[PDB]
Amino acid sequence: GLLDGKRILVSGIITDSSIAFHIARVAQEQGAQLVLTGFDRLRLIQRITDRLPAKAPLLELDVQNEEHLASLAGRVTEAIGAGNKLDGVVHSIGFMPQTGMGINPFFDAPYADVSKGIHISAYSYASMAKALLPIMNPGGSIVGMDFDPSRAMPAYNWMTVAKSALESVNRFVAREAGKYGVRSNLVAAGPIRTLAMSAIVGGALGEEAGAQAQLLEEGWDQRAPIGWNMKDATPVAKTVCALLSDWLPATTGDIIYADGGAHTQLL
Amino acid sequence: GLLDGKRILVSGIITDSSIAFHIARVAQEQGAQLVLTGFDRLRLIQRITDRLPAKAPLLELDVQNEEHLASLAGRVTEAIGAGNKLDGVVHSIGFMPQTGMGINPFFDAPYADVSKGIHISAYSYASMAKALLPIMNPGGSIVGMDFDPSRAMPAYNWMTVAKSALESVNRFVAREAGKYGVRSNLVAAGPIRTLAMSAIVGGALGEEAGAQAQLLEEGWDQRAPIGWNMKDATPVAKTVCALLSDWLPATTGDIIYADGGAHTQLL
Amino acid sequence: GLLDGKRILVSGIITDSSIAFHIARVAQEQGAQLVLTGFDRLRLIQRITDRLPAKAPLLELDVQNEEHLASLAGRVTEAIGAGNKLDGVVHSIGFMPQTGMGINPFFDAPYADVSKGIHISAYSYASMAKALLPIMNPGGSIVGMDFDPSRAMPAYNWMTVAKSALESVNRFVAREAGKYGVRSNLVAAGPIRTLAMSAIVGGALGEEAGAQAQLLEEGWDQRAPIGWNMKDATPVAKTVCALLSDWLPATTGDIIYADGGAHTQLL
Amino acid sequence: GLLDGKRILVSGIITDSSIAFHIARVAQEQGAQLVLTGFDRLRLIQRITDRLPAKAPLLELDVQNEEHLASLAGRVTEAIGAGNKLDGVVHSIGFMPQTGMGINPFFDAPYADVSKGIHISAYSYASMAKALLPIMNPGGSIVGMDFDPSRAMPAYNWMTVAKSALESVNRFVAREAGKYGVRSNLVAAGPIRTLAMSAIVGGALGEEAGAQAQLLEEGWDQRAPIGWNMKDATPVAKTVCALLSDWLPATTGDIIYADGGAHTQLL
Ligand SMILES: NC(=O)c1ccc[n+]([C@@H]2O[C@H](COP(=O)([O-])OP(=O)(O)OC[C@H]3O[C@@H](n4cnc5c(N)ncnc54)[C@H](O)[C@@H]3O)[C@@H](O)[C@H]2O)c1
Ligand SMILES: NC(=O)c1ccc[n+]([C@@H]2O[C@H](COP(=O)([O-])OP(=O)(O)OC[C@H]3O[C@@H](n4cnc5c(N)ncnc54)[C@H](O)[C@@H]3O)[C@@H](O)[C@H]2O)c1
Ligand SMILES: NC(=O)c1ccc[n+]([C@@H]2O[C@H](COP(=O)([O-])OP(=O)(O)OC[C@H]3O[C@@H](n4cnc5c(N)ncnc54)[C@H](O)[C@@H]3O)[C@@H](O)[C@H]2O)c1
Ligand SMILES: NC(=O)c1ccc[n+]([C@@H]2O[C@H](COP(=O)([O-])OP(=O)(O)OC[C@H]3O[C@@H](n4cnc5c(N)ncnc54)[C@H](O)[C@@H]3O)[C@@H](O)[C@H]2O)c1
Ligand SMILES: CCCCCCc1ccc(Oc2ccccc2C)c(O)c1
Ligand SMILES: CCCCCCc1ccc(Oc2ccccc2C)c(O)c1
Ligand SMILES: CCCCCCc1ccc(Oc2ccccc2C)c(O)c1
Ligand SMILES: CCCCCCc1ccc(Oc2ccccc2C)c(O)c1
């Protein structure tokens, strides 16, 4: 068990194709004992999570809610037992209003929409860290989910900006987490067929956006020297468990590419 | 005259040590005809700008004001004469509440403060572009001011995150500006003794912050293979005029380092 | 005249579609007085260079020849007049044996071939600098030609490795050049139809290589937010003259992308 | 056992403070069965390797020797048993003549010296891959040792250029290795007190070089958000075993920083 006896908080499960769901599953297969957080649709999330290899408390967390944040650590400690701490935290959370994405002009997204997106997608990495570092063990790991924003691309639009912000935040979180002996890192994943991605591909953000997204997926597996299967989230779950383990002890404020190697290849 | 007969909008002048002020001065020395925008203290800015080599209309612009943005192009066209367009736009604007900077813990900046910062420092590059592209000429140039955020550093804190966002925005603005034959780029400057920098160094953000800022300035001139004078903004003004000229016609969505070469050297 | 009264050494002219040829032409249009160097086919190069806007001495230079290097500065000073120095140096030189490129397996290039390539394409930037810095003026500029090697690509193969080396060398040359008040930088160009590129596209390195090169050119203009014309070397000549001018005084050990903005865009 | 029943080739052991030695030790602790290669001083290396947790064949390999390379796979297969293949390959090899390093001027390293360095330090990653890929299993991993060359630094000089080349080579090796289902990646380590590093620090490359190296080590632990112990190679051995394991299946042609997070922090 890569994660034997480690205690890990996992956020961002919404369906059974969530990257968070596969992160959780793999971790439990590797002996981790889990605590889960969900946003808003808790009966759905309970129902979905009942299918994991093992039982795990589910805690409500709206990342934009001050009270949820303020009460989070107490709730976790309650769930894992007093005198016990977390060895790992997983941030698999994101959101951007439609106006900030797809065939909707870049220039036409109101700041209030862009602000909400950055709030949930970037700022919350800092917020969760703030709430949870006090109840983490030395040797601990924090992991967030990333999509390489170092270049502009069609349709991703303002989410790219949110990911750029996130990478920056991750480096500062690394500075804070360090005072606790805790690592902080991001996993940069290739495209995966999830609820959030289904939106885009299915034309809910405009048909041309859906088309560019599809071309994206296809170019990816082409570039990837080992290929890329956008229906299989396991390779990125396995990568996230690696960061949660003891086997990358000298890495922090850093980005790990679980993308088939695509970003290293121009063509 | 590098900028003979070009029409250039310059924002961000607040004192006579503003990077924007030296940008404006150099440009006029190079034959540009200017239009200026200022935030809030317009009598001060008029008074300051009266010292430029030549007269130039001053227009009010609060980057967070919808009406200012909406009316901006009409006001400019009024100032430069109907049937005339802009050949250049300079964004030299930034702001971050104290909570997001210095010895104030990273984790203690409220999102409302961080949001305001990103609004003025990143989002506004898109906002200005949106308002001004319609009245720009093909061959035109947009330039923003940057401070290399690719690594975390003490004290800069949330402004770094804002700069990360800005670089991302710049790449998307490049996509829009391209439809007009207009370039968009950022200048990444070394440390310059300005009002905004005086804050930091002078301990208004905490003494330890002031001390780290001073160490920063010093390491900079050390690393720079040609050195760095933090009292002299001319080298970065000259660099911004280069981008505004016809001599970098094949560059866009890109970052130019006016930093003495510091970022290319580890030690 | 951007380059009025500046004295500039330009290497790498072989035909009239050489990037070096267009660099030279633009510079002379901008008032520079030139000295030229050529490799091996000097009658051809004389004949080609007779078509520049103005007369300019031609000096022999095999970059792998110790004597040429050793005698270079004496020959230049002879050409520009004693007591006169160089304000600029242009490195537009490259070579890689066929074994290191195209459909010829990466693994099948003998080190002796790869060594020759790196010698001429990377190491020589240091060699020229060494020979010429002693006869340069403060305020001076050295410029090399680059093709962004930060990612792997088909066919470019070992030349990519040579370009990676070159970028590294450029940063160290910046350290040396700095002791003289001289800048050193690279221009990263998009694809241009030259003799060296004609090889590749024309199938002399294998048909599949020719095909990947053609796809490359096409994706480029697609990605470029302002487009890209691979038949027009002027935009990169103009960019090289900018670096040779006084208008980027705070840039060194750095890379400037004259690539239409392509590298900033994923899709 | 992270590496249970995997067969791994490890190169670059010279003393018991070699990164390769600690790589080998950790791997065996994790259940790997090993084959070792050494350069030139084989009695020394045998003697040193006798101290590993388990016995492992030692094979001679001069990376510049064509016959060694040509015969390598036959020798390995002989050592691991016919019908058995390698699951992992470790490249922990480097060399640069003194002229290319330290207080010896950058400009004064003869190409023949720089060529030898690049041969052993960069080119050999391709050479080993070429010799060994045919006897590797799908799911396999190749790992090389790196020192982040993205910026210039004192004293490292031409080794930096060699590391720049190596990173480039790694991306192309990823393309070849991919045809076999094999990953290729580099580990970028922080400073470690080894034989090769002892040289530098001890003034054998000049006292000023020794002094800059010492300052380097010190700045490192300062920048590292989790710190850095230059006497402890275990954290980078653990990181190399992670890449050799099944837990980073979607990473290739890539670089992993085992550097305490130093490269992510400016100050
Ligand atoms: N699917 C891809 O292709 C891909 C690739 C790289 C990175 N990522 C990243 O992976 C992470 C998870 O995305 P996914 O692909 O699994 O989609 P998803 O729909 O399965 O999960 C996204 C998560 O965001 C959570 N969330 C949204 N608003 C919230 C709020 N206000 N408070 C708390 N939680 C909130 C949702 O409830 C949900 O569980 C994201 O950060 C995403 O950007 C996805
Ligand atoms: N001084 C440095 O060391 C340095 C280095 C690199 C980059 N920069 C960047 O250069 C630019 C200018 O900064 P500076 O050093 O000249 O400081 P400065 O004080 O001279 O100018 C900053 C500008 O922000 C403007 N501004 C703030 N809020 C605004 C709003 N709501 N609407 C419209 N304008 C607003 C101010 O009025 C002011 O003119 C910034 O974007 C900054 O981050 C500065
Ligand atoms: N054409 C492109 O698409 C492109 C794009 C980006 C960068 N570059 C770079 O631009 C530079 C010039 O290439 P080009 O496109 O003009 O091709 P080119 O054929 O016009 O010029 C290449 C130059 O290399 C010189 N050279 C080769 N071996 C030499 C030696 N031993 N000693 C002295 N000189 C030697 C040649 O004589 C020649 O003039 C190169 O360094 C190249 O890699 C080209
Ligand atoms: N020690 C550090 O601080 C550090 C940091 C980052 C990366 N690295 C890299 O780690 C790797 C190992 O270096 P080290 O620190 O363990 O020093 P080391 O002295 O322990 O090992 C270096 C290896 O190079 C091998 N070698 C040299 N020439 C060879 C040849 N012609 N053929 C075959 N093998 C040859 C040596 O025999 C030796 O085992 C290198 O590639 C190095 O650059 C070292
Ligand atoms: C541009 C076409 C390529 C698609 C990128 C892949 C992807 C898919 C889903 C992603 O998650 C989100 C996307 C938007 C908003 C919120 C989330 C979680 C995500 O962050 C990335
Ligand atoms: C961290 C210590 C090093 C100082 C960095 C130099 C600097 C100085 C002033 C800058 O402008 C701002 C800084 C904060 C908020 C707003 C602006 C314009 C700025 O963006 C950068
Ligand atoms: C891989 C398909 C894309 C082509 C890249 C464009 C290009 C064209 C010519 C170039 O110059 C050389 C190429 C090889 C060897 C020598 C030189 C000068 C060069 O460096 C780059
Ligand atoms: C510049 C001062 C900082 C030292 C860098 C750390 C280091 C130490 C040893 C290294 O290995 C070599 C160094 C030179 C030549 C050969 C090798 C293996 C190496 O590659 C890196």
mmCIF file with all atom_site columns, C-alpha atoms in Angstrom, chain D residues 143-221:
data_model
loop_
_atom_site.group_PDB
_atom_site.id
_atom_site.type_symbol
_atom_site.label_atom_id
_atom_site.label_alt_id
_atom_site.label_comp_id
_atom_site.label_asym_id
_atom_site.label_entity_id
_atom_site.label_seq_id
_atom_site.pdbx_PDB_ins_code
_atom_site.Cartn_x
_atom_site.Cartn_y
_atom_site.Cartn_z
_atom_site.occupancy
_atom_site.B_iso_or_equiv
_atom_site.pdbx_formal_charge
_atom_site.auth_seq_id
_atom_site.auth_comp_id
_atom_site.auth_asym_id
_atom_site.auth_atom_id
_atom_site.pdbx_PDB_model_num
ATOM 1  C CA . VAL D 1 143 ? 15.742 8.203  -15.784 1.00 0.00 ? 143 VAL D CA 1
ATOM 2  C CA . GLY D 1 144 ? 18.630 10.654 -16.145 1.00 0.00 ? 144 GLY D CA 1
ATOM 3  C CA . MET D 1 145 ? 20.167 13.065 -13.626 1.00 0.00 ? 145 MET D CA 1
ATOM 4  C CA . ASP D 1 146 ? 19.850 16.783 -14.261 1.00 0.00 ? 146 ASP D CA 1
ATOM 5  C CA . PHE D 1 147 ? 20.850 20.106 -12.743 1.00 0.00 ? 147 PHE D CA 1
ATOM 6  C CA . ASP D 1 148 ? 18.524 22.941 -13.775 1.00 0.00 ? 148 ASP D CA 1
ATOM 7  C CA . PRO D 1 149 ? 20.432 24.846 -16.512 1.00 0.00 ? 149 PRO D CA 1
ATOM 8  C CA . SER D 1 150 ? 17.625 27.239 -17.433 1.00 0.00 ? 150 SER D CA 1
ATOM 9  C CA . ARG D 1 151 ? 19.689 30.110 -16.017 1.00 0.00 ? 151 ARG D CA 1
ATOM 10 C CA . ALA D 1 152 ? 23.394 30.915 -16.132 1.00 0.00 ? 152 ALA D CA 1
ATOM 11 C CA . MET D 1 153 ? 25.400 30.680 -12.931 1.00 0.00 ? 153 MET D CA 1
ATOM 12 C CA . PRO D 1 154 ? 29.025 31.071 -11.867 1.00 0.00 ? 154 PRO D CA 1
ATOM 13 C CA . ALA D 1 155 ? 31.462 28.169 -12.223 1.00 0.00 ? 155 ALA D CA 1
ATOM 14 C CA . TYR D 1 156 ? 29.027 25.617 -13.651 1.00 0.00 ? 156 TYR D CA 1
ATOM 15 C CA . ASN D 1 157 ? 29.903 27.168 -17.029 1.00 0.00 ? 157 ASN D CA 1
ATOM 16 C CA . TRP D 1 158 ? 29.993 24.545 -19.805 1.00 0.00 ? 158 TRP D CA 1
ATOM 17 C CA . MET D 1 159 ? 28.367 21.849 -17.717 1.00 0.00 ? 159 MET D CA 1
ATOM 18 C CA . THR D 1 160 ? 25.244 24.052 -17.806 1.00 0.00 ? 160 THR D CA 1
ATOM 19 C CA . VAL D 1 161 ? 25.342 23.956 -21.584 1.00 0.00 ? 161 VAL D CA 1
ATOM 20 C CA . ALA D 1 162 ? 25.705 20.158 -21.359 1.00 0.00 ? 162 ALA D CA 1
ATOM 21 C CA . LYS D 1 163 ? 22.638 20.014 -19.104 1.00 0.00 ? 163 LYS D CA 1
ATOM 22 C CA . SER D 1 164 ? 20.669 22.209 -21.508 1.00 0.00 ? 164 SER D CA 1
ATOM 23 C CA . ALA D 1 165 ? 21.548 19.740 -24.274 1.00 0.00 ? 165 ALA D CA 1
ATOM 24 C CA . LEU D 1 166 ? 20.560 16.824 -22.006 1.00 0.00 ? 166 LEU D CA 1
ATOM 25 C CA . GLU D 1 167 ? 17.071 18.176 -21.352 1.00 0.00 ? 167 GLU D CA 1
ATOM 26 C CA . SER D 1 168 ? 16.616 18.512 -25.132 1.00 0.00 ? 168 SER D CA 1
ATOM 27 C CA . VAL D 1 169 ? 17.880 14.969 -25.758 1.00 0.00 ? 169 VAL D CA 1
ATOM 28 C CA . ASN D 1 170 ? 15.502 13.680 -23.066 1.00 0.00 ? 170 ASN D CA 1
ATOM 29 C CA . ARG D 1 171 ? 12.494 14.941 -25.049 1.00 0.00 ? 171 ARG D CA 1
ATOM 30 C CA . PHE D 1 172 ? 13.624 13.138 -28.195 1.00 0.00 ? 172 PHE D CA 1
ATOM 31 C CA . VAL D 1 173 ? 14.466 9.981  -26.259 1.00 0.00 ? 173 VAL D CA 1
ATOM 32 C CA . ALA D 1 174 ? 10.871 10.173 -24.983 1.00 0.00 ? 174 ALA D CA 1
ATOM 33 C CA . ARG D 1 175 ? 9.704  9.967  -28.630 1.00 0.00 ? 175 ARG D CA 1
ATOM 34 C CA . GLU D 1 176 ? 11.743 6.803  -29.279 1.00 0.00 ? 176 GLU D CA 1
ATOM 35 C CA . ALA D 1 177 ? 11.045 5.179  -25.914 1.00 0.00 ? 177 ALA D CA 1
ATOM 36 C CA . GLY D 1 178 ? 7.344  5.764  -26.530 1.00 0.00 ? 178 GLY D CA 1
ATOM 37 C CA . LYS D 1 179 ? 7.350  3.300  -29.452 1.00 0.00 ? 179 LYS D CA 1
ATOM 38 C CA . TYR D 1 180 ? 8.169  0.678  -26.777 1.00 0.00 ? 180 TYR D CA 1
ATOM 39 C CA . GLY D 1 181 ? 5.696  1.751  -24.094 1.00 0.00 ? 181 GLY D CA 1
ATOM 40 C CA . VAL D 1 182 ? 8.720  3.063  -22.167 1.00 0.00 ? 182 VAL D CA 1
ATOM 41 C CA . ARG D 1 183 ? 8.914  6.401  -20.320 1.00 0.00 ? 183 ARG D CA 1
ATOM 42 C CA . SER D 1 184 ? 11.891 8.783  -20.346 1.00 0.00 ? 184 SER D CA 1
ATOM 43 C CA . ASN D 1 185 ? 12.404 11.554 -17.787 1.00 0.00 ? 185 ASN D CA 1
ATOM 44 C CA . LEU D 1 186 ? 15.013 13.605 -15.956 1.00 0.00 ? 186 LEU D CA 1
ATOM 45 C CA . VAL D 1 187 ? 15.392 14.317 -12.239 1.00 0.00 ? 187 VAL D CA 1
ATOM 46 C CA . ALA D 1 188 ? 16.661 17.825 -11.533 1.00 0.00 ? 188 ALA D CA 1
ATOM 47 C CA . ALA D 1 189 ? 18.482 17.559 -8.183  1.00 0.00 ? 189 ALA D CA 1
ATOM 48 C CA . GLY D 1 190 ? 19.654 20.148 -5.700  1.00 0.00 ? 190 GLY D CA 1
ATOM 49 C CA . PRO D 1 191 ? 23.341 20.286 -4.716  1.00 0.00 ? 191 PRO D CA 1
ATOM 50 C CA . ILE D 1 192 ? 24.698 17.082 -3.178  1.00 0.00 ? 192 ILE D CA 1
ATOM 51 C CA . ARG D 1 193 ? 28.136 16.493 -1.607  1.00 0.00 ? 193 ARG D CA 1
ATOM 52 C CA . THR D 1 194 ? 29.549 13.887 -3.989  1.00 0.00 ? 194 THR D CA 1
ATOM 53 C CA . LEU D 1 195 ? 32.942 13.265 -5.552  1.00 0.00 ? 195 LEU D CA 1
ATOM 54 C CA . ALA D 1 196 ? 32.079 15.481 -8.528  1.00 0.00 ? 196 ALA D CA 1
ATOM 55 C CA . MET D 1 197 ? 30.813 18.231 -6.234  1.00 0.00 ? 197 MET D CA 1
ATOM 56 C CA . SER D 1 198 ? 33.761 17.859 -3.846  1.00 0.00 ? 198 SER D CA 1
ATOM 57 C CA . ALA D 1 199 ? 36.046 18.856 -6.708  1.00 0.00 ? 199 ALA D CA 1
ATOM 58 C CA . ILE D 1 200 ? 34.266 22.203 -7.214  1.00 0.00 ? 200 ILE D CA 1
ATOM 59 C CA . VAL D 1 201 ? 33.795 23.091 -3.519  1.00 0.00 ? 201 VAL D CA 1
ATOM 60 C CA . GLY D 1 202 ? 37.380 22.125 -2.673  1.00 0.00 ? 202 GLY D CA 1
ATOM 61 C CA . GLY D 1 203 ? 38.929 24.693 -5.004  1.00 0.00 ? 203 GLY D CA 1
ATOM 62 C CA . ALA D 1 204 ? 40.312 22.282 -7.606  1.00 0.00 ? 204 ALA D CA 1
ATOM 63 C CA . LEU D 1 205 ? 38.542 24.507 -10.148 1.00 0.00 ? 205 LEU D CA 1
ATOM 64 C CA . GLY D 1 206 ? 39.786 27.679 -8.471  1.00 0.00 ? 206 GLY D CA 1
ATOM 65 C CA . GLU D 1 207 ? 39.085 29.174 -5.048  1.00 0.00 ? 207 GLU D CA 1
ATOM 66 C CA . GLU D 1 208 ? 36.572 31.730 -6.297  1.00 0.00 ? 208 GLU D CA 1
ATOM 67 C CA . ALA D 1 209 ? 34.701 28.867 -7.976  1.00 0.00 ? 209 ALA D CA 1
ATOM 68 C CA . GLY D 1 210 ? 34.739 26.948 -4.707  1.00 0.00 ? 210 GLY D CA 1
ATOM 69 C CA . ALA D 1 211 ? 33.344 30.025 -2.989  1.00 0.00 ? 211 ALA D CA 1
ATOM 70 C CA . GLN D 1 212 ? 30.505 30.552 -5.463  1.00 0.00 ? 212 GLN D CA 1
ATOM 71 C CA . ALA D 1 213 ? 29.602 26.857 -5.150  1.00 0.00 ? 213 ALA D CA 1
ATOM 72 C CA . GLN D 1 214 ? 29.407 27.221 -1.389  1.00 0.00 ? 214 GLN D CA 1
ATOM 73 C CA . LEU D 1 215 ? 27.189 30.305 -1.655  1.00 0.00 ? 215 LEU D CA 1
ATOM 74 C CA . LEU D 1 216 ? 25.039 28.316 -4.077  1.00 0.00 ? 216 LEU D CA 1
ATOM 75 C CA . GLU D 1 217 ? 24.488 25.465 -1.580  1.00 0.00 ? 217 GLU D CA 1
ATOM 76 C CA . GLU D 1 218 ? 23.534 27.978 1.079   1.00 0.00 ? 218 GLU D CA 1
ATOM 77 C CA . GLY D 1 219 ? 21.096 30.016 -0.965  1.00 0.00 ? 219 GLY D CA 1
ATOM 78 C CA . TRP D 1 220 ? 19.451 26.715 -1.893  1.00 0.00 ? 220 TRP D CA 1
ATOM 79 C CA . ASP D 1 221 ? 18.339 25.612 1.572   1.00 0.00 ? 221 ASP D CA 1
#
